[PDB]
């Protein structure tokens, strides 16, 4: 009374569980994990392109040339930029970087600069180019100053009016930096420049700036109670920039050619380099994965698995075994 056929299904030794609306933890035959949960806690090249690691410098400290950043005076094409939460080297000398976050944002859109010399330090016949330095900005113990801009001083007790132009005869855009010095009282104003009433005008087809020092009494910072305020502009190819001042001028010397625009990023990370390489990067480490999702960190650069806030994410691919 036998000779029987039966219909049935697969089973195996699998503990791989999934969840559903009506049930949790349902062991099934086969499942597919879709969430990347794992990273190497190291920052890397992406891909075959090393990031620009500013160490302990800030972006400000880098572009102005804070003496403790001479390390970055000449710098190759980069993939992304890495800044600490709080770089200790920003402005050796206190003050302001005007439009700083707007500039920082331009950077994320830029893969490579090319420092050039637009107004040679040696071209100041009737002013003192090499005497402006501070114990606030020190290089190798000796007092120094930002390396990309020049703190002009009166030469033989006279500060004639300045009139320098510079013509961008390059093909690329130019990032130009310059500053103004706020002194502490008439006395000091008299010491560095002769003139007591002072201004700085900057012109370009776009720019129309006028600046007057606020000679005033401020709390000491890095030992200095005076202040510097910096300002920047993109000078277009064929455009030209004209400075005019009778004192307190912090002139450009080196400006940067934007030679390459790309997808970059400034990221804040304390984690350090690893001579490795990846195609996806995260502030807390890199990702080699084939998953479609990950829960490492919301900020990524490069081709990445999309981010999710989940610990567990698995597709039931098989049926409900026992």
């Amino acid at each position: 009374p036998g000779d029987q056929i039966c219909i049935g299904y697969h089973a195996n030794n699998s503990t791989e569980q999934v969840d559903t609306i009506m049930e949790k933890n349902v062991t099934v035959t086969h499942a597919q994990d879709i969430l990347e949960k794992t990273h190497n806690g190291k920052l890397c090249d992406l891909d075959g392109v090393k990031p620009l690691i500013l160490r302990d410098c800030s972006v400000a400290g880098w572009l102005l040339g804070n003496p403790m950043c001479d390390e970055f005076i000449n710098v190759p094409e980069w993939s992304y930029i890495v800044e600490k939460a709080n770089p200790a080297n920003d402005l050796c000398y206190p003050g302001n970087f005007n439009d700083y976050e707007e500039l920082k944002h331009l950077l994320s859109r830029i893969n490579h600069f090319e420092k050039i010399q637009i107004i040679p330090k040696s071209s100041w016949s009737d002013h003192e180019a090499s005497s402006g330095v501070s114990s606030a900005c020190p290089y190798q113990g000796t007092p120094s100053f930002f390396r990309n801009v020049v703190w002009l001083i009166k030469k033989n007790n006279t500060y004639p009016t300045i009139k320098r132009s510079y013509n961008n005869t390059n093909q690329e855009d130019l990032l130009i930096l310059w500053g103004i010095h706020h002194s502490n009282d008439a006395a000091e104003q008299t010491k560095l420049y002769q003139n007591p009433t002072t201004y700085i005008s900057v012109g370009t087809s776009t720019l129309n700036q006028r600046l007057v020092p606020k000679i005033a009494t401020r709390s000491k910072v890095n030992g200095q109670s005076g202040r510097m305020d910096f300002f920047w502009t993109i000078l277009k190819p064929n455009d030209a920039i004209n400075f005019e001042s009778n004192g307190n001028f912090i002139a450009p010397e080196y400006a940067y050619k934007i030679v390459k625009k790309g997808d970059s990023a400034i990221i804040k990370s304390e984690v350090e380099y690893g001579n490795c390489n990846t195609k996806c990067q995260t502030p807390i480490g890199a990702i080699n994965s084939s998953m479609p999702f990950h829960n490492i960190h919301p900020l990524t650069i490069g081709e990445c698995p999309k981010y999710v806030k989940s610990n567990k994410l698995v597709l039931a691919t098989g049926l409900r075994n026992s």
């Binding site: 056929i5 039966c6 697969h10 990524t300 999710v308 597709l315």
Partner: protein, 172 residues
């Protein structure tokens, strides 16, 4: 589950099968052995592979957060930036999570439906020619050789041929 087959009339699966997901097991004189349903284990793997691939594509265009910095007198807009990016990250986490929960359930019941439909495929092929034990099995009224059992799976089945030793064997 929903279609009462897997863990339904049939209370468990077969460790012994490994050639495929669903199939039949035969216990006749000329031998015994398991066999997988190529035509219906294939239909299901294909379907489930589209699921997995349609879920990834549906997600491959979610929000991608971007770093942005503000100064200490732009605290309002930094907080606006913040609550925005978290808000999307949440909208997309809720999306992914729940799409997965929902399609997991459908995928299971999909397997349920596939098993039951297979049982019916055979059940209709034999009618009265075999008895329904009630736990996934058909007890042949007659004697079925290995070229006959592989005919219920082959797609068509000699009932007029076999009808004869079936009524004959039924009365007693």
């Amino acid at each position: 589950g929903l279609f009462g087959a897997i863990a339904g009339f049939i209370e468990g699966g077969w460790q012994g099968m490994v050639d495929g997901w669903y199939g039949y097991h035969h216990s006749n004189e000329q031998g015994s052995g398991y066999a997988a349903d190529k035509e219906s284990t294939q239909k299901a793997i294909d379907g489930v592979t589209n699921k997995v691939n349609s879920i990834i594509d549906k997600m491959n265009t979610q929000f991608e957060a971007v770093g942005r910095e503000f100064n200490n007198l732009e605290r309002r807009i930094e907080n606006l930036n913040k609550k925005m990016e978290d808000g999307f990250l949440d909208v997309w986490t809720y999306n992914a999570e729940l799409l997965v929960l929902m399609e997991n359930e459908r995928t299971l019941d999909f397997h349920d439906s596939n098993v039951k439909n297979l049982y019916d495929k055979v059940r209709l092929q034999l009618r009265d020619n075999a008895k329904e034990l009630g736990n996934g099995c058909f007890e042949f009224y007659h004697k079925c050789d290995n070229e006959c059992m592989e005919s219920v799976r082959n797609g068509t089945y000699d009932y007029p041929q076999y009808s004869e030793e079936a009524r004959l064997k039924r009365e007693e």
